């Protein structure tokens, strides 16, 4: 009744909501830049699902006014599939339609992830919070791609979280076989919202882009994401990044939407996460040195790592690194 391919046939976004029009962007080669040609660089935040902020009493304009306040000049909204079909597809909508707006009005572009995790191909998730279907996730960029068409704001398609086999768990996929279907992602998108700008991930859960790069989306707007962990790879750090990732942001623009850190000793942490400190000074430094675009992991005190404490929206040691850096090279 709720899922995907029963459409509720859902009301059109009302637009009247909104009074504001950020600059519209484009890939321009290797970066991003706006109307006048300008390079742009976005550094900011994932929220925490729409469907958990609802439940826990802080989907409101308090929290987005907060983000707002660090500096923040992106915000990425992380749309679980199984939040999705909680809510069902007109439920969910409402929720991202008012995120949305709040975003646009406080000058804030949105990243639209479908926050996945697995291998699509073979239906092959993490974990259950995470599955879906190809037809499932087409539809998904079906509905949002038209409902924002036109809404500067809303810049970013994130096709899929983090891909990953898993060393085999989640079973086999060639780069060759997703590409082809972040090509029909995107012609889906682009088809329905012609200025829309696309993000597409490689494996080792959106690390690697060294097979993207030898054999890459053949579609106009993409830039390439990459999730540097902490503990993704060792000493030297930068080496191995440029290697890994890090190069082919001298070609295309490279839009790093997941990253962040925190001690042993802080709650939930795990591997590939865990760090001193030093790791949020070389990261911003390392995506400075190169022009890269992040987005910081997570606007929430329940979900690891931990960019606030609690709901007094104290900064975390990662959330005092990153504000500072959002505050001082962005707005």
Same mark, same amino acid.
């Given at each position: ?112 992830? &479908? ?178 675009? &992040?987005?910081? &992991? ?12 609690? &709901? ?20």
């Amino acid at each position: 009744t709720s899922g995907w391919w029963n459409a509720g046939d859902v009301p059109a976004f009302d637009k009247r909501q909104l009074s504001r029009q950020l600059p519209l962007i484009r890939v321009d080669g290797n970066r991003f830049v706006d109307e006048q040609g300008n390079v742009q660089i976005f550094r900011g935040v994932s929220i925490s699902d729409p469907n958990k902020l609802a439940k826990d009493q802080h989907f409101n304009k308090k929290h987005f006014d907060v983000i707002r306040s660090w500096g923040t000049n992106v915000v990425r909204i992380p749309v679980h599939p199984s939040a999705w079909r909680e809510r069902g597809v007109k439920g969910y909508l409402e929720l991202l339609d008012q995120a949305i707006t709040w975003n646009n009005e406080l000058g804030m572009y949105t990243i639209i992830d &479908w926050h996945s995790m697995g291998n699509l191909k073979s239906e092959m998730f993490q974990n259950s919070m995470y599955h879906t279907s190809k037809g499932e996730t087409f539809d998904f960029w079906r509905r949002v791609s038209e409902r924002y068409n036109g809404i500067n704001s809303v810049a970013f398609y994130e096709i899929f979280n983090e891909p990953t086999v898993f060393s085999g768990r989640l079973g086999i996929v060639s780069w060759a076989e997703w590409k082809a279907i972040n090509e029909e992602a995107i012609t889906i998108i682009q088809a329905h919202n012609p200025n829309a700008i696309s993000l597409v991930a490689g494996f080792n859960w959106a690390y690697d882009l060294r097979e993207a790069a030898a054999n890459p989306i053949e579609r106009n707007n993409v830039a390439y994401v990459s999730h540097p962990y902490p503990q993704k790879v060792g000493a030297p750090y930068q080496a191995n990044w440029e290697r890994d990732f890090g190069f082919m942001a001298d070609k295309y623009p490279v839009f790093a939407t997941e990253i962040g850190y925190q001690l042993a000793s802080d709650k939930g942490a795990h591997i590939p996460v865990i760090d001193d400190g030093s790791y949020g000074p070389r990261i911003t430094d390392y995506f400075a040195k190169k022009g890269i675009s &992040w987005v910081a &992991w997570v606007f929430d005190p329940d979900w690891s790592p931990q960019m606030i404490k609690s &709901w007094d929206y104290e900064p975390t040691m990662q959330g005092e690194h990153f504000r500072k850096v959002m505050l001082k090279e962005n707005k």
